[PDB]
Design a protein around this nucleic acid. Sequence first.
DNA 1: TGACATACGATCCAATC
DNA 2: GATTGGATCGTATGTCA
Length: 775
Amino acid sequence: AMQATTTRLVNRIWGEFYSNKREIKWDGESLGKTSAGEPLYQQALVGGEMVAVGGAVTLEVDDPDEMPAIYFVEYMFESTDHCKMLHGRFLQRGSMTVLGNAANERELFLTNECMTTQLKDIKGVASFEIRSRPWGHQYRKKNITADKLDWARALERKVKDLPTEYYCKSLYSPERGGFFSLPLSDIGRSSGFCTSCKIREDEEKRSTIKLNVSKTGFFINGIEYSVEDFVYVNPDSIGKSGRNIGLRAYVVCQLLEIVPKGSFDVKVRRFYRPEDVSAEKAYASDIQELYFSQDTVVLPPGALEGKCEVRKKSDMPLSREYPISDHIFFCDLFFDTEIRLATLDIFAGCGGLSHGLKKAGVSDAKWAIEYEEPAGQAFKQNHPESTVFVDNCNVILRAIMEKGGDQDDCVSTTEANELAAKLTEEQKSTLPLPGQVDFINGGPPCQGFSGMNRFNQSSWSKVQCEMILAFLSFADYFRPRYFLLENVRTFVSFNKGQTFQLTLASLLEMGYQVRFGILEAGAYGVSQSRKRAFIWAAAPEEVLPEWPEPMHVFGVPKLKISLSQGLHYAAVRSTALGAPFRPITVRDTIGDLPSVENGDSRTNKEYKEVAVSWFQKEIRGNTIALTDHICKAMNELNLIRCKLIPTRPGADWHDLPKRKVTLSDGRVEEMIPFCLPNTAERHNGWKGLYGRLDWQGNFPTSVTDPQPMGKVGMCFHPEQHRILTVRECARSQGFPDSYEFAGNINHKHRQIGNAVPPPLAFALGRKLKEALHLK
DNA sequence: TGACATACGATCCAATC
DNA sequence: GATTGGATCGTATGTCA
Ligand SMILES: [Zn+2]
């Protein structure tokens, strides 16, 4: 329970943790002409002051109490009517963005909105500059100095009531959910052409249904469809821990003809899927298998959702990735009706995020920081070439800053200073130094903001929330190329969004490109409902990664993030009405494991049955040792209650009779727990407590302590009178069967419940790998 | 100290009106 | 605009053997 060690920058940004008639003349002469035949100018005198390409003008607004609008000048031209006109791009204020009250008063953000006005209608010319600043760990001490000089000159200008000076260094895209680098070669060309207008024109050209001159094809949503192509159709256009029951995947069809009926209709021939026969057939079949039919449909062009490929089993790719990512299917039967980055992992845990990023090919987890002995031991067991520190991150940061000589840039506690002096010389020799770390990744605690926390204004929750500041100080000190932050969904709305806004403002104060999003794990290949928030940060001359495409059906709506002024952003689509692949069930995950009783402790066992489903075949791999198939022991009364709950979908504590139980030691208890009928009707009746899983459903969210009378509940096996084992809980989060956990059973459950799914980490790392090849 | 069992609030957001 | 269900890497307290 140690308070965070920050740099001065983070301390100053947060401040609430440890320490607080007019004559209009064309200047010069034209330098070219617009295609319409209009002279272009570079400078103009308005009211005695100079308006130039690269400056800013203010336009007047209706309501008086609102501040005027600022526009960046792109070009000036003289039209046929001899009217003096300019084109401008909108410069938004930081207070009108997702930053809110955390934004600077002098910082403006460039947008893709445009304007064209006459020079008579401008109110004034503003003092404006574009800030381009070098990137590196070797410049941050110089950047501090200038920044101080910039702050002082501001307050004096404020106390004398002088005009404000503005600067711009980023571009705000609310439809991409982020702040991006300025395209410096496309702005201020003083030419009649503008890139934002070109973007809008191309956008409006790509929303129309147009036929090819040969009626052999058609353009829709920016995709070209030809005859004999394979296409996706919504299932509706042709015809608890479980809500994917009856959610169907895309229908795969071959396009045969274009029917005239310019309006037209399409003719398709459909394929069938293994789950269109039975659930037993879908259990034993591959996810990429289809069946041939002769059934033909006539559809409107708007029923098509994308293109795919259908091959033979022999011609399939020989690379097998667990998140499939491939739009390729195979048909056999018939249906009769180089760039590896040096990575520092902070708050490493057991290593799921690392595991995925290492499988993607972008990270070598060279250093890791984990204060818990069993978790550090597990990380060392699974990643043997990594240097693991089993200290507090505050102590490690203090030691690194002492090694660099910047003790006076560090804000720390006496306790952390004393603990940093106790490190041995070999430990201090192995610490990373700035200029050696290219990637920083980490999942700060998820307990301060989680909604399940009844006590969030207590002393323990506040420090866990405060670890964000230490995580940001690591990025401030090391200035890496790439930065990845992971947390819960409620991190973006914790206390009216202030923590999210302050994190974004801190990342922007250093000079990063930042983007944010929320992702659902079940759409990427796990049988779980897990909603997580991700933040990407990149250097000004890097490419900021995109988001991975979800390819599994899962019944979750649009995960949205609130952007101020009534706007919202969604990172990915909803797969509830259709997706390339079917959902993963509980029987797909745990249906091949052998039977165990209550409180089994044998750690090393043997597999008895072979893998049947796709998920089983690819989680087992080539492993012959079954490890950690162990469950927690329930007492006599809880085991009596567990055996008396039916093996039906949706069975919970409401199925327990009102009765008195005599135990072995002559105690008389009551079968129904007193707390469950007491606080009900405030909590939706506690559905799923003492609840059994459904074979055709999915798992609930993986928590650190699975117990029958918890908030989440539903830890009972669908058929066996026990709680789920460690291996089953690791299979629900996507861990391979060869992954090793350390400690007692409680520590292993804690390690599994805290992790990022390795499949989702691999999906994110693949997009980072694509971003690294585009530089 | 530790292990294990019990008791249990407020906010956000999408269907259904 | 109104109001219901559903969501969900939990924390504090008391007994105990
Ligand atoms: Zn324009």
